Design an enzyme around this catalytic site. Structure first.
Site, PDB file in Angstrom:
ATOM      1  N   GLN A  49       0.850  -1.195   0.034  1.00  0.00           N
ATOM      2  CA  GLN A  49      -0.053   0.052  -0.083  1.00  0.00           C
ATOM      3  C   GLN A  49       0.922   1.284  -0.126  1.00  0.00           C
ATOM      4  O   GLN A  49       0.314   2.468  -0.553  1.00  0.00           O
ATOM      5  CB  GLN A  49      -1.183  -0.100   1.212  1.00  0.00           C
ATOM      6  CG  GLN A  49      -1.993  -0.704   1.306  1.00  0.00           C
ATOM      7  CD  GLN A  49      -2.912  -0.675   2.527  1.00  0.00           C
ATOM      8  OE1 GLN A  49      -3.857   0.158   2.567  1.00  0.00           O
ATOM      9  NE2 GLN A  49      -2.769  -1.413   3.609  1.00  0.00           N
ATOM     10  N   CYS A  89     -10.699   0.614   3.930  1.00  0.00           N
ATOM     11  CA  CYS A  89      -9.153   0.439   3.555  1.00  0.00           C
ATOM     12  C   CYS A  89      -8.599   1.834   3.073  1.00  0.00           C
ATOM     13  O   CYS A  89      -9.391   2.519   2.397  1.00  0.00           O
ATOM     14  CB  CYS A  89      -9.334  -0.495   2.284  1.00  0.00           C
ATOM     15  SG  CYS A  89      -7.750  -0.712   1.627  1.00  0.00           S
ATOM     16  N   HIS A 135      -3.408  -7.775   0.904  1.00  0.00           N
ATOM     17  CA  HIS A 135      -2.669  -6.916  -0.024  1.00  0.00           C
ATOM     18  C   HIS A 135      -1.319  -7.318  -0.312  1.00  0.00           C
ATOM     19  O   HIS A 135      -1.003  -6.892  -1.651  1.00  0.00           O
ATOM     20  CB  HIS A 135      -2.622  -5.641   0.943  1.00  0.00           C
ATOM     21  CG  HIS A 135      -3.530  -4.574   0.927  1.00  0.00           C
ATOM     22  ND1 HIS A 135      -3.831  -3.922   0.080  1.00  0.00           N
ATOM     23  CD2 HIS A 135      -4.124  -4.220   2.158  1.00  0.00           C
ATOM     24  CE1 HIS A 135      -5.056  -3.116   0.544  1.00  0.00           C
ATOM     25  NE2 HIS A 135      -5.202  -3.248   1.775  1.00  0.00           N
TER      26      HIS A 135
HETATM   27 ZN   LIG Z   1      -6.301  -2.473   3.025  1.00  0.00          ZN
END
Ligand SMILES: [Zn+2]
Length: 165
Positions: A49, A89, A135
């Site tokens: 991320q 998220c 993820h």
């Molecule tokens: Zn996430």
């Protein structure tokens, strides 16, 4: 100097590689990721991320925000049962939706000091673990939604960034 990638960025689909040794550089990624997560008021963050393609996850699900957990090379070694809650998220700002998950997990991982450890989790932690390890596999919670709902979320987010670069 990290910021979070947002859906539909293709970098969010990169499969993370294992961390080979827990070095001061890895420790620094860990520290930075925790600072990011707390600042964005998240309860979990995966390296993927913030565009770091290595199997690092940080989590704090506590309401007092002082119970950090670091998971390097995490692996779910067993899943049990079915459960699900509303998830969000940081990489999908503004979207929340119920996601079907395992109820319980047994997880093996290295901590911030390279110590391998194992634990069982249920409830919010089990969910957050599953979310965050998704993820690292290039999966996002919007992948569990209907196409029409996912496409709308994508279109709204693309709009937000349409004048970038
Ligand atoms: Zn996430």
């Amino acid at each position: 100097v990290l910021q979070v990638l947002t859906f539909p960025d293709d970098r969010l689909r990169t499969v993370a590689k294992p961390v080979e040794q827990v070095t001061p550089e890895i420790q620094q990624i860990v520290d930075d990721m925790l600072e990011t997560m707390y600042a964005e008021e998240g309860i979990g963050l995966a390296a993927t991320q913030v565009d770091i393609h290595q199997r690092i996850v940080v989590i704090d699900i506590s309401e007092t925000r002082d119970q950090p957990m670091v998971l390097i090379n995490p692996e779910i070694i067993e899943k049990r049962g079915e459960d699900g809650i509303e998830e969000g998220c940081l990489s999908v700002p503004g979207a929340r939706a119920l996601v079907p998950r395992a109820a319980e997990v047994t997880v093996k991982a290295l901590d911030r000091n390279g110590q391998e450890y194992q634990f069982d989790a249920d409830d919010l932690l089990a969910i957050c673990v599953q979310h965050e390890l998704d993820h690292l596999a290039g999966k996002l919670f919007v992948d569990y939604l209907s196409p029409l709902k996912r496409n709308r979320i994508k279109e709204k987010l693309e709009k937000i960034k349409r004048f970038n670069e």
